[PDB]
Amino acid sequence: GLAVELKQSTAQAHEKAEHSTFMSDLLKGRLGVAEFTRLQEQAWLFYTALEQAVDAVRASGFAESLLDPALNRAEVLARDLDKLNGSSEWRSRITASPAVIDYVNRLEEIRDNVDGPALVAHHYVRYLGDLSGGQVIARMMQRHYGVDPEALGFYHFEGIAKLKVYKDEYREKLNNLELSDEQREHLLKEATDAFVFNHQVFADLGKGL
Amino acid sequence: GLAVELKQSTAQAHEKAEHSTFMSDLLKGRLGVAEFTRLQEQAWLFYTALEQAVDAVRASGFAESLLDPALNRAEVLARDLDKLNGSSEWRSRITASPAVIDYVNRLEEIRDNVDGPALVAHHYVRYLGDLSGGQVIARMMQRHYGVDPEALGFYHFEGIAKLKVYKDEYREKLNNLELSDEQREHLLKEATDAFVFNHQVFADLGK
């Protein structure tokens, strides 16, 4: 089963990304709403790129059931940033950190190559991550930084009644994807690369704090 | 209820802050009016930030009954400083210690995010301190160091007639303050942070 192999193959890079100093400090309450906002700004940049790549792969007829448009985060994230920042100023201010540039560049390569297996890897890392840990992170943002729950829309999936069932169904869709050995290896490799990109995003965010 | 949990949750940080060497030395008579004046100068910087956050949160409609404007200290404190320093010179001279920079930053972050629960935590730590330990401080600045009570206006709250009643009513307001679980957790978190900020102010004053 691909779902199990993905979880095992990515374990090392996943642990390292999740336990970055930036995220560790954020979740312990050692930073502030500013740092959470910077994170969400960088995320808006990479989710925008990710969702271009998802759109292309879905349109090609690959992994359609997995690529549920209800998962789209970019618009919801923009609304969160409007509230966090207090205006639309952020759109003209924000720019990609070096890690985000590299991450976006890869996502754009995947988009332009319509690389379905690689896209699924990135989709897993971001969306299954959001579905799995979103409630935890959101709770920490309220507990530590007093973030308005209305500005945590990113962590809420409107089109999904029950997260546990959805995550189980997601993993089964992974299992049922028709993939050649070459495609599966490509996907597994990409999933580790995706965790590494995210680790580097956190490293940039944490620099000089 | 909340008042009891707040006291219990903050107990360790509170004890550490209260028993700082600087504050301990000041209260027992080992220091002098100079050190008291340095403290009050730093306090004016953080009360200024605190009361900007209080004003923002009150205006937003949160915890109105708790955020009694009679508690405002900044103006009274500036007058104490004029007396202690002999003129307004202190305004252009004083600068925030490293600990006060961090404390002021948090208070400004609370103001900017109009973070009501966080504000209440900080309000409790300062003003209920002033209404209790502060009364001992005022008595001992006069007794140990001969500070004229005219320079201790900070510790006198006009329009507050009976402190025990005031404090009992404050705690009842805390108990009746409507909070989500997340807001309540945040208030508790922040209250411990507030004690720690104050401990650090004392540590810098010792240096």
Side-chain angles (χ1 to χ4, degrees), chain A residues 1-157 159-177 179-181 183-209, chain B residues 1-15 17-149 151-161 163-206:
Chain A
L2 179 61
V4 169
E5 187 173 22
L6 261 170
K7 193 166 182 181
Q8 292 169 348
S9 184
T10 60
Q12 184 177 54
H14 189 175
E15 182 279 317
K16 282 176 179 56
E18 210 172 275
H19 295 153
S20 64
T21 298
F22 176 79
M23 279 304 307
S24 171
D25 281 350
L26 190 71
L27 296 175
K28 285 167 173 74
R30 293 185 194 179
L31 305 180
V33 69
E35 283 71 36
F36 172 65
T37 308
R38 299 300 86 78
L39 169 62
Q40 298 302 66
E41 288 166 358
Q42 296 301 300
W44 181 82
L45 295 167
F46 66 74
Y47 273 92
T48 295
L50 176 56
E51 288 167 8
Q52 292 176 352
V54 177
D55 287 345
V57 170
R58 186 194 298 107
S60 81
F62 184 92
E64 283 190 63
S65 61
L66 188 83
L67 308 181
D68 181 359
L71 296 169
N72 281 166
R73 295 297 84 192
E75 291 189 328
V76 82
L77 198 44
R79 294 197 296 269
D80 288 346
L81 290 168
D82 286 342
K83 297 177 182 62
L84 287 164
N85 287 303
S87 87
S88 313
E89 59 86 31
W90 59 269
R91 291 178 181 272
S92 64
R93 169 178 50 82
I94 71 170
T95 202
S97 83
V100 175
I101 291 176
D102 288 350
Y103 190 8
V104 165
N105 285 348
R106 180 54 180 166
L107 291 167
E108 290 185 355
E109 290 178 348
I110 292 169
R111 177 197 68 199
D112 291 343
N113 286 329
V114 197
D115 185 343
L119 184 277
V120 167
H122 280 272
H123 196 274
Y124 168 81
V125 170
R126 284 317 312 192
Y127 301 111
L128 199 54
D130 295 337
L131 290 164
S132 294
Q135 302 319 111
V136 169
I137 298 166
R139 180 50 161 269
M140 296 300 85
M141 299 309 89
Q142 297 196 243
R143 178 179 298 173
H144 293 313
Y145 309 123
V147 179
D148 175 6
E150 297 196 340
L152 297 165
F154 174 81
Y155 298 103
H156 162 71
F157 290 86
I160 305 171
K162 9 32 67 211
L163 291 183
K164 182 63 257 180
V165 174
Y166 193 96
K167 294 182 292 177
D168 287 346
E169 289 166 353
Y170 186 101
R171 281 180 288 257
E172 287 310 318
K173 286 174 199 170
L174 290 176
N175 291 335
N176 287 137
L177 287 180
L179 298 173
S180 70
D181 294 343
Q183 287 176 312
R184 188 184 63 251
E185 290 311 309
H186 187 63
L187 190 160
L188 291 166
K189 179 196 181 289
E190 192 73 23
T192 279
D193 293 346
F195 278 114
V196 174
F197 281 125
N198 279 279
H199 192 347
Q200 295 167 162
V201 177
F202 295 146
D204 287 357
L205 284 162
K207 282 180 183 73
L209 293 183
Chain B
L2 183 61
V4 171
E5 183 155 38
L6 180 53
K7 182 175 174 168
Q8 287 173 357
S9 182
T10 58
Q12 276 181 14
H14 192 170
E15 193 179 33
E18 204 167 287
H19 295 158
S20 73
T21 305
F22 172 88
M23 211 44 253
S24 174
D25 282 351
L26 188 61
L27 262 159
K28 72 200 285 175
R30 289 176 179 177
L31 303 184
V33 194
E35 286 82 7
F36 173 63
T37 306
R38 301 297 89 73
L39 169 65
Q40 295 302 68
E41 289 166 358
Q42 295 306 299
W44 183 81
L45 297 167
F46 65 74
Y47 272 89
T48 293
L50 174 60
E51 291 166 5
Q52 288 172 1
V54 177
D55 286 345
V57 168
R58 187 198 295 107
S60 81
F62 186 81
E64 179 188 18
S65 68
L66 276 161
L67 305 179
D68 179 3
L71 294 168
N72 283 161
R73 296 296 85 191
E75 185 187 343
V76 163
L77 186 50
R79 294 289 294 273
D80 285 344
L81 289 174
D82 291 338
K83 294 285 193 201
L84 292 163
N85 288 306
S87 75
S88 66
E89 61 81 27
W90 61 267
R91 287 178 182 271
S92 53
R93 168 181 55 79
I94 70 166
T95 200
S97 79
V100 173
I101 288 164
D102 291 344
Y103 190 8
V104 167
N105 281 346
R106 174 64 59 80
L107 293 168
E108 288 176 344
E109 285 149 20
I110 288 167
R111 178 202 61 197
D112 293 349
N113 189 31
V114 193
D115 186 346
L119 186 273
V120 169
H122 279 270
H123 191 270
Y124 166 84
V125 171
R126 286 309 313 189
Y127 298 113
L128 282 216
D130 296 335
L131 296 164
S132 59
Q135 304 304 295
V136 185
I137 296 168
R139 186 123 281 160
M140 300 323 294
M141 299 306 92
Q142 180 271 297
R143 288 180 182 177
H144 291 320
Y145 310 127
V147 178
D148 196 287
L152 299 171
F154 174 84
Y155 299 105
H156 167 254
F157 292 78
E158 192 73 16
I160 301 179
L163 302 182
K164 181 169 200 180
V165 176
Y166 194 94
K167 291 183 276 186
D168 291 352
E169 288 178 0
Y170 192 103
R171 292 187 230 95
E172 178 68 358
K173 284 172 183 174
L174 288 175
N175 292 337
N176 301 139
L177 185 65
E178 192 192 317
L179 299 166
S180 70
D181 294 348
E182 298 93 334
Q183 287 176 314
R184 192 173 162 151
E185 293 171 5
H186 182 51
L187 192 157
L188 296 168
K189 188 265 194 199
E190 197 71 34
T192 279
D193 284 359
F195 282 111
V196 176
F197 282 121
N198 280 279
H199 189 165
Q200 288 309 293
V201 173
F202 295 147
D204 283 4
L205 285 156

